[PDB]
Design a protein around this ligand. Structure first.
Ligand SMILES: CC(C)(COP(=O)(O)OP(=O)(O)OC[C@H]1O[C@@H](n2cnc3c(N)ncnc32)[C@H](O)[C@@H]1OP(=O)(O)O)[C@@H](O)C(=O)NCCC(=O)NCCS
Ligand SMILES: [Mn+2]
Ligand SMILES: [Mn+2]
Length: 225
């Protein structure tokens, strides 16, 4: 029933792209024959969010016609999708998200969710450039926790950047600029890469366009290339 993530997706590409979300942990969800060890000795919170988003993903992978299968993690934590597919996962207090795409229509996917709340104390100066840390204030309404939106867009960038280059991207390795739609709750962002955009295959990564949205007290960001 959940469609919030769609508020930051390209509708014109919904043929090859599917999404599924949940706002909590439904009882009786289980891991999978090969996922159980990845979660074997983690505390309950980590357990449930891991199970729930992987249920969301398989729903979305089904809706694209792909039999269910384990989504293991690779070194550096990236989810492992069945061949031909790509996508992104996110979880936080109140939200579980999965977006999946078919390769030759979607280069890769990056999504992130945060509670639409101020950042904790020392955090906004470690993920923001001084440029961003001064300009963003002049692009969004006061009711917007823009430092949190910035944080959120940073990680969507990283999540879409990584499967393409398998290289680290720091919070200072991309500069992001925001604009807002007339609503004051949704808008656009652009991520300029401050380092070699060399990809594992194909043209470099320079600028990532994406969408953000404040919706139901969550922050949502998505990059789909
Ligand atoms: O927002 P979140 O911080 O919860 O996103 C976390 C997710 O990012 C994804 N992620 C972690 N490392 C990643 C990477 N290097 N590249 C892409 N996605 C990654 C993982 O799927 C993780 O979900 P899991 O650890 O539950 O599988
Ligand atoms: Mn999480
Ligand atoms: Mn996040």
């Amino acid at each position: 029933v959940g469609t919030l993530v769609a508020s930051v997706l390209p509708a014109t590409v919904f043929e090859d792209l599917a999404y599924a979300e949940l706002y909590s942990d439904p009882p009786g969800l289980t891991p999978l024959p090969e996922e159980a060890p990845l979660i074997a000795r983690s505390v309950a919170k980590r357990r449930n969010e891991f199970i729930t988003v992987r249920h969301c993903a398989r729903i979305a992978l089904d809706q694209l016609g792909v039999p269910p299968a384990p989504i293991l993690k690779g070194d550096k934590g990236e989810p492992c999708w069945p061949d031909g597919m790509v996508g992104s996962l996110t979880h936080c207090a109140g939200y579980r998200g999965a977006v999946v795409g078919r390769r030759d229509a979607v280069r890769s996917v990056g999504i992130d969710a945060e509670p639409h709340d101020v950042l904790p104390n020392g955090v906004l100066d470690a993920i923001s450039l001084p440029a961003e840390r001064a300009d963003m204030p002049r692009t969004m309404p006061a009711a917007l926790h823009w430092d949190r939106i910035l944080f959120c867009a940073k990680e969507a960038t990283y999540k879409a950047w990584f499967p393409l280059t398998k290289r680290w991207l720091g919070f200072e390795d991309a500069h992001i600029t925001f604009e807002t739609d007339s609503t004051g709750w949704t808008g656009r962002f652009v991520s300029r890469i401050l380092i070699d955009g060399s990809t594992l295959s194909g043209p470099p990564l320079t600028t990532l366009r994406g969408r953000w949205s404040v919706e139901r007290g969550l922050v949502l960001t998505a990059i789909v290339l």
